[PDB]
């Protein structure tokens, strides 16, 4: 199978260099870079694949019977002789900005609410109120939710005061905030990637790191520990997920993990099982003797990896 990108990439090579440059101009620079890397790394079409991409493009061309030109100039020239160039350029810019500002509105709705809020946190409360009004009511609420109480209250107060409904400047405001995203990147800054490394590190090493960060900042340490939280107590993970783990992990591995686990952990991991299964697990735990903690920790790490995979699949929430 050939992915949709690869078919498009092969078509981009096939359509010619001048057409490819025109498409690059008509499209996004990230797409231009992706196509350039693809045509540099390796060609995406084989003889069967080239046949498939060319055939599907042909079926697209049959269906896209344009009987028309892009006329980004030719259409205007026909309009200009009939009515004059002036009464079209401004209205056209306004229409494009309306398409552009709606595109930005949808993009902000799709992208993460707290990221949008912090991108707009420094901005004007009037800006926040008007963008909230323009956004979807789910999205507007999501940006509003994160804000501090005072800023949020000022935002709702200014929502009513926003009666000017201003129009070219709003589009330029969206343009200004748009140009800041490509520099933002980030990803490395967020604590959770650092927190995952702490889980990956050697037990005593992350214990020492936890002590050191508690000395550095107790609040930050508590936040990272809350990020740590994975089946250390019943309420955070819930009895249904406790049942889910036991039916998805080997019983011997679960018992070996429970050897070093707390008695509340054993109780929470035995309540879900039936009477027979709970009795078998308890008898096995009682009969099995002491084992070197390295194997217990390795099996616990494997079990927690299974838990993380389940959370990534998203069957149930943890925390």
């Amino acid at each position: 199978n050939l992915s949709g990108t690869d078919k498009s990439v092969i078509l981009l090579m096939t359509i010619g260099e001048d057409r490819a440059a025109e498409v690059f101009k008509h499209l996004s620079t990230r797409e231009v870079q992706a196509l350039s890397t693809a045509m540099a790394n390796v060609r995406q079409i084989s003889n069967k694949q080239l046949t498939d991409v060319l055939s599907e493009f042909e079926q697209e061309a049959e269906q896209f019977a344009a009987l028309n030109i892009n006329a980004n100039e030719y259409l205007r020239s026909v309009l200009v002789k009939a009515l004059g160039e002036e009464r079209a350029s401004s209205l056209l810019e306004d229409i494009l900005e309306t398409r552009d500002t709606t595109s930005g509105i949808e993009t902000l709705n799709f992208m993460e609410p707290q990221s949008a809020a912090d991108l707009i946190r420094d901005e004007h409360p009037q800006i926040i109120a008007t963008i909230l009004v323009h956004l979807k009511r789910s999205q507007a609420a999501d940006i509003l939710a994160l804000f501090d109480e005072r800023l949020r209250h000022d935002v709702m107060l200014r929502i009513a005061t926003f009666g000017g409904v201003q129009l070219a400047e709003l589009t330029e405001v969206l343009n200004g905030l748009l140009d800041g995203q490509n520099l933002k990147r980030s990803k490395m800054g967020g604590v959770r990637t650092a927190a995952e490394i702490i889980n990956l590190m050697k037990t005593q090493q992350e214990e020492a790191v936890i002590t050191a960060v508690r000395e550095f900042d107790g609040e930050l340490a508590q936040k990272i520990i809350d990020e740590m939280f994975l089946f250390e107590n019943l309420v955070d993970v819930d009895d249904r997920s406790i049942q889910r783990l036991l039916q998805e992990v080997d019983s011997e591995s679960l018992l070996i993990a429970l050897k070093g686990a707390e008695p509340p952990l054993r109780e929470k991991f035995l309540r879900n099982m039936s009477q027979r299964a709970a009795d078998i697990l308890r008898d096995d735990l009682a009969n099995r003797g002491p084992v070197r903690l390295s194997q217990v920790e390795n099996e616990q790490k494997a079990i927690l990896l299974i838990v993380r995979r389940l959370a990534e699949t998203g069957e149930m929430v943890i925390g």
Partner: peptide, 27 residues
């Protein structure tokens, strides 16, 4: 000026001290 550009009444003003002007504010 900026809230009037947005049409805001300005009856719920905010005061910023030490905080540098944002990109939009500088514009």
């Amino acid at each position: 000026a900026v809230d009037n550009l947005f049409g805001g009444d300005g009856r719920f003003p905010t005061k910023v001290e030490g905080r540098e002007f944002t990109h939009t504010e500088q514009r």
